[PDB]
């Protein structure tokens, strides 16, 4: 029974860390999007002309 508990905890730790990694991926992607918004082209020169 104790070894079964240990195995279950191992598997759950693995899955939990996988989910944490994916959540970090999503946060990184949100930061990427936020960064993209700033890098848009502008019509400064066309406006001046």
């Amino acid at each position: 029974k104790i070894k079964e508990c240990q195995e279950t905890i191992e598997q759950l730790q693995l899955e939990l860390e996988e989910l944490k990694v994916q959540l970090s991926q999503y946060e990184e992607n949100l930061l990427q999007a936020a960064q993209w918004k700033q890098t848009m082209p502008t019509d400064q020169e066309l406006n001046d002309l």
């Binding site: 992607n29 990427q32 993209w36 848009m40 082209p41 019509d43 020169e45 066309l46």
Partner: protein, 49 residues
């Protein structure tokens, strides 16, 4: 011409973002007639969408 080139370059520099051919044509329509039919913001509107 240069600004439209920059706009589409910026679009394709971020493939994660998805622009439909219909959306791309809409951006083309907006960019082509600037200051004769609509202000430049409508381009940024479509990108930020």
């Amino acid at each position: 011409q240069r600004l439209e080139h920059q706009v589409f370059t910026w679009i394709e520099q971020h493939p994660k973002l998805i622009f439909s051919n219909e959306r791309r044509q809409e951006i083309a329509r907006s960019i082509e007639g600037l200051y004769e039919e609509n202000r430049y913001e409508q381009v940024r509107e479509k990108l930020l969408a």
